[PDB]
Amino acid sequence: AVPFNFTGFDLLIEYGMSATDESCIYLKKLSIPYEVTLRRTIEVPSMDIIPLNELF
């Protein structure tokens, strides 16, 4: 679901939690490396605002 990503975004990771309990917080950690780059597709580097006065 990438739509709002900064341009410094280049990696991700997933510390998965592996649960098991009877009455306890007994868990572990499972971590994944993920590298992903970006398609800089379209950019709007400028804007400006003009008013108008003619009726067409």
Added chain:
Amino acid sequence: SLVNSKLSNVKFKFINSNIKVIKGEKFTMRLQIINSSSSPLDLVVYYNNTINPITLENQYQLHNKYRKIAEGIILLSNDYKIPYFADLRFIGIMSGYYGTLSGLKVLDLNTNELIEVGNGASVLI
């Protein structure tokens, strides 16, 4: 028609005739760039749609000159990198006689001098 440079051998003319008729709609405008081919490149356009911020009747005369220079036409492809021929892309909003339409400025990206093309005209009736 023609104005000479200040820095290079570049000269600017408009192939389409400098007096032309249009309504408020779109129109095609075409500019000559002929120079020396020692560095034949790297010019930029921009139209600079903002008011030059500037006797009382002259004080409201220079403003009403500038507020119809910077509000009349808008350049639909500004920051046009040139590379000779280029078809510059305007549409005009409000109507009048825009003789020496003077907003548009090309500029040499090395040794930045504010080159102006104060030529051409457009009636909008």
